[PDB]
């Protein structure tokens, strides 16, 4: 038209990001008034809204700082607000609103508003027909323009509406996108739940695993399928069963007091309690400033203990008594372990060691006792008279081995007193019934690196149930023998047999102290203290899992380590394939397989919460008028509270103001004054507010609609119901005078749908020979047949016309041979103008875009570019009128058969 901007010259607004300006800028120019200043030139985006700009600044000296948000409002006097949903289902008709605004103060605007045509969408906008309304928007006000469209192609898709205003150089357009999606929904599912633990039925040949694929035979076509693995690390890793509680050892801090042996009885639980708490870092809970007072009980025990130091560097009960062999060795063990805690004298420790090697050793190296203690309960399992030259050789030796890191050059022939003592016990290691003498000798051996073979086996197998070195009778000797053994197992670096031994000690909870517990205390809290040191810091969880997918070219040998704080991964498959998943060595972990697909629908999509029924019919006696009737009820025998009916007019129709006010005055029904006070022509959307609706009956209402503007085609109307508290669970029906279910003419079967709003076949005056030969050679034309209609088969959705092929004037992609049959397809509404009759012959040609089907699901669509035309019978041709035609067909067939198209 004249005096308005043309659609082609309008460039639609497009840039509508939710966030932008993700930029960095350094302030460089000099500080006037101690404040730098940068001028930034930004390009505002297309969104008509208010932006909020947030600046955070970082400085070396003044640090971090966060500005107050700064608003910017972008605005126009006239614009379109295209209200698109987040997504829409494919082949599902939907209505969208374009809202036009006129913020001019004293001036109506006459606008032409237009929906552009997009192949992805079936609408009244078509290839050769625009869809344009003309509306008048009052000042300081807006106007809804509805558009019914059916998305046909999946994925991210685009809608464009534009608008020019007459009599002004003013235009607008909005180009937004929406996600078109299939049906179904998302399904998590696991295939395997394994445990990657070698040396536990994974065996010596490093656990080799196999995990087959997913089934996925109920799947809906043309979607993704992402597998997801969960490679966990459920950790008892750091093989460290929780240490003994710190609150239980409160009775161990004993103030040492007595003679020469009673002083060493009291000093035992205190010194070992410190050695324990030092490594386990449990000084927080027990009492931190108590260590400075508990160290002074050991310094009090040490300073008192040197008062019983005889001239020859030896120890005993009193100074008057002859010296004991074992007691001087135990003093070296407690002093060697307490070198780190208190100030020991150099003359004292190695001095007690010099006396032992020179004075107390026999030909073969049995450190025999010379003065048995009065308090014999202190020496523990040695108190038993059975084999007290085998254990007694090992005990004194252990004191030498722990004190060897310090005493080297002073005690000259120390290497030698260790080798010969290690001969006597090693040789006679196979002559020990009791588990005590087996174990106490076993720790002495392992410190040197001489515990191998049958002597290393007898050590392992003496343990009853593979954990504890028990003996018949008193159970304090049982706990002592095993703790010596745990010190042996820690030195060997055999982390296979370590866990079961300590696990039993944790289920004993022997807190020491009491009476006759000297050795059971010193050894259990030393062995479980040395355990926290040498027990693996990071253990392992060392699986080399190599996943080989036959879709993929290469393996993916994923490493696993207890160190990375994740312990989880995930791949992303594209095709459902069977793959190997081979583990390797140590640790533990989960191993799931979760694909994700879309299934078929099941018949309860649509209107889950409401029933909606809408009809439009002609009026009674009295230009064009009709009776819209809306019938709705909720779902569940329990009236819904407060609902909305959002109605939209068929183009050119408007509601009867009289019938509306009649409705609004009715109880349980409300229509805003704003809607009622509006003009007749400027009112094509409507909201009727209901107070309730149940599933007892059906709540029904109806009202007159009058056609004021006259137009061709005319877009269906729409009624949408929902409760106020939930828009998402809605239900919409459409209405139209000549379509019912106001559905736009589409052509659906199986997956996809053709927009069928176009003309049925190529229309019709001349039908020249020179006409047919042009249009039969138009670009797309991929076939021209002579066909006999074998069997006509009708339906409501689409009529299946079966054609027999007489001759193939032109062959194309479909390699049909003469005599064979091909199925032609046409919508419900084309049958009227087609008149396809059985055993009547036909001349048909059409495009490659008309092939619906895979192969041999081949069908022929009789679309707008398809040409069909009647061919009188061979003997029927001989007749006055229709001789003109019959000849031109045969004349056309020979031009086509002989010369074909010039292309």
């Amino acid at each position: 038209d004249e005096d308005i901007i043309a659609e082609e010259n309008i460039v639609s607004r497009s840039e509508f990001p939710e966030s932008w300006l993700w930029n960095v800028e350094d302030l460089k120019e000099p500080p006037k008034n101690g404040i730098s200043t940068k001028l930034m030139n930004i390009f505002l985006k297309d969104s008509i809204t208010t932006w909020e700009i947030l600046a955070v600044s970082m400085s070396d000296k003044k640090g971090i700082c966060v500005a107050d948000p700064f608003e910017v409002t972008v605005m126009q006097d006239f614009f379109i607000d295209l209200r698109l949903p987040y997504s829409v289902v494919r082949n599902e008709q939907v209505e969208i609103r374009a809202v036009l605004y006129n913020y001019r103060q004293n001036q109506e605007l006459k606008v032409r508003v237009e929906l552009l045509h997009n192949p992805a969408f079936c609408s009244l906008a078509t290839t050769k027909r625009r869809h344009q309304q003309t509306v008048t928007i009052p000042p300081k006000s807006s106007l809804s323009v509805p558009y019914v469209i059916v998305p046909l192609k999946t994925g991210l898709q685009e809608v464009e509406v534009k608008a020019a205003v007459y009599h002004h150089f003013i235009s607008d357009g909005v180009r937004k996108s929406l996600k078109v999606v299939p049906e179904g929904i998302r399904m998590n599912k696991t295939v395997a739940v394994r445990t990657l633990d070698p040396e536990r039925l994974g065996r010596e040949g490093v656990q080799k695993e196999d995990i087959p694929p997913a089934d996925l035979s109920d799947q809906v076509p043309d979607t993704e399928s992402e597998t997801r693995i969960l490679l966990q690390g459920t950790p008892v890793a750091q093989m460290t069963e929780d240490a003994v509680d710190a609150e239980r050892l409160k009775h161990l801090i004993v103030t040492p007091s007595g003679c020469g042996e009673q002083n060493m009885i009291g000093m035992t639980p205190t010194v070992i309690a410190v050695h324990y708490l030092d490594e386990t870092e449990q000084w927080e809970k027990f009492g931190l400033e108590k260590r400075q007072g508990a160290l002074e009980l050991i310094k009090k025990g040490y300073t008192q203990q040197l008062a019983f130091r005889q001239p020859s560097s030896a120890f005993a009960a009193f100074v008057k008594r002859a010296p004991s062999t074992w007691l001087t060795a135990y003093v070296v063990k407690v002093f060697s372990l307490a070198v780190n805690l208190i100030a020991i004298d150099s003359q004292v420790l190695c001095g007690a060691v010099k006396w032992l090697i020179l004075e107390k050793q026999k030909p073969d190296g049995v450190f025999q006792e010379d003065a048995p203690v009065i308090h014999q309960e202190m020496i523990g399992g040695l108190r038993n008279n059975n084999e007290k030259d085998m254990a007694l050789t090992a005990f004194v030796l252990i004191s030498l081995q722990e004190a060897k890191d310090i005493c080297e050059e002073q005690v000259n022939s120390l290497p030698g007193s260790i080798t010969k003592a290690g001969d006597f016990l090693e040789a006679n290691y196979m002559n020990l019934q009791r588990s005590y003498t087996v174990a106490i000798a076993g720790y002495a051996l392992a410190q040197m690196g001489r515990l191998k073979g049958p002597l290393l086996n007898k050590f392992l197998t003496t343990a009853k149930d593979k954990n504890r070195w028990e003996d018949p009778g008193k159970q304090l000797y049982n706990v002592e023998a095993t703790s010596y053994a745990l010190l042996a197992l820690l030195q060997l670096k055999d982390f296979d047999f370590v866990p079961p031994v300590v696990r039993w000690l944790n289920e004993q909870r022997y807190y020491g102290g009491g009476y006759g517990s000297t050795q059971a205390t010193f050894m259990v809290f030393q062995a479980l203290a040395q355990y926290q040191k040498d027990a693996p810091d990071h253990q392992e969880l060392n699986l080399d899992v190599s996943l080989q997918l036959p879709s993929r070219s290469s393996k993916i040998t994923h490493r696993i380590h207890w160190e990375s704080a994740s312990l989880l991964r995930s791949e992303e498959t594209k095709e459902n394939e069977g793959f190997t998943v081979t583990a390797e060595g140590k640790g533990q972990g989960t191993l799931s397989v979760v694909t994700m697909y879309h299934a078929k629908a099941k018949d309860q999509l649509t209107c889950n919460k409401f029933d909606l029924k809408v009809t439009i019919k002609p009026a009674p006696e009295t230009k064009n008028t009709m009776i819209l009737e809306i019938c709705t009820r909720y779902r569940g025998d329990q009236d819904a509270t407060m609902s909305i009916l959002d109605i939209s007019m068929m183009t050119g129709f408007a509601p009867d103001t009289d019938d509306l006010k009649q409705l609004a005055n009715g109880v349980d029904r409300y229509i805003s004054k704003y809607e009622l006070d509006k003009a007749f022509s400027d009112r094509n959307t409507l909201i009727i507010y209901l107070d309730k609706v149940s599933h007892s009956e059906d709540d029904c209402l109806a009202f007159k609609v009058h056609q004021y503007f006259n137009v061709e085609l005319i877009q269906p109307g729409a009624v949408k119901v929902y409760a106020y508290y939930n828009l998402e669970e809605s239900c919409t029906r459409f209405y139209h005078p000549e379509k019912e279910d106001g559905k736009l003419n589409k052509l659906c079967r199986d997956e996809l749908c053709r927009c069928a709003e176009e003309n049925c076949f190529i229309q019709k005056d001349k039908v020249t020979l020179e006409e047919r030969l042009d249009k039969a050679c138009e670009p797309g034309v991929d076939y021209v047949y002579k066909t006999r209609l074998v069997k006509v088969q009708l339906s409501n959705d689409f009529d299946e016309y079966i054609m027999a092929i007489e001759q193939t004037i032109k062959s194309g992609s479909d390699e049909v041979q003469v005599g064979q049959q091909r199925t032609f397809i046409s919508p419900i509404k084309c049958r009227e103008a087609l008149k396809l009759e059985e055993k009547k012959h036909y001349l048909m040609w059409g495009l490659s875009s008309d092939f619906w089907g895979e192969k041999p699901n081949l069908s022929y669509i009789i679309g707008k570019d398809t040409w069909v035309e009647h061919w009188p019978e061979e003997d029927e041709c001989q007749d006055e009128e229709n001789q003109k035609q019959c000849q031109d067909l045969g004349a056309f067939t020979e031009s086509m058969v002989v010369f074909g198209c010039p292309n």
Binding site: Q76, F78, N106, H167, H168
Partner: protein, 221 residues
Amino acid sequence: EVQLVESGGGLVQPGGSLRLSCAASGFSFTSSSVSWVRQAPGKGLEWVGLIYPYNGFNYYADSVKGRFTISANTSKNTAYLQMNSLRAEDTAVYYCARNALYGSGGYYAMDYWGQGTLVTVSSASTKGPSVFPLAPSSGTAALGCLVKDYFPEPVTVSWNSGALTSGVHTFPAVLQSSGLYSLSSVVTVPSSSLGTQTYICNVNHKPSNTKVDKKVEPKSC
């Protein structure tokens, strides 16, 4: 087609009143607005005022506020300028133009204009012109017409009902010491065209109903 037409211009006594009208056609009056601009003899354009026909909203140049007024009949797509307390310095040609809104935020250009009407604010009396032949003096022969002693402006001279437009020169009027205007309209024609062609000059003076068609030819003597 969009087109605008002013009318009602003429002579007024100082202090007096006058109502110009502007006939809009070819567009919806209600969706647009109309401006009155004026031009003093041989000087710049001065915008006078808007009207928004939709709801009758006005704006006025200070030079006119309290004196001038714009109204509209929306059914007859006409706008009106009612002038009161007219001064000497209000003498001008008065145009009406359509305001079209190009930008955003209410900027407008004026894309269609009427032809304008001349309003002249003087004590003087309406006087019709005396029209005299300017005879050609026996290859190109000039002839013309003298339009003498008239007031106020304007006069419109044309030749043979506007058939002859080629090489005509209707000169500016000139204010005689008497107070009345006189101008010449001259037209050069090929001297051969005399005798055969007829030459009538078509003076028309709206303010005094004076219409004259004078023939101009050589003499007998």
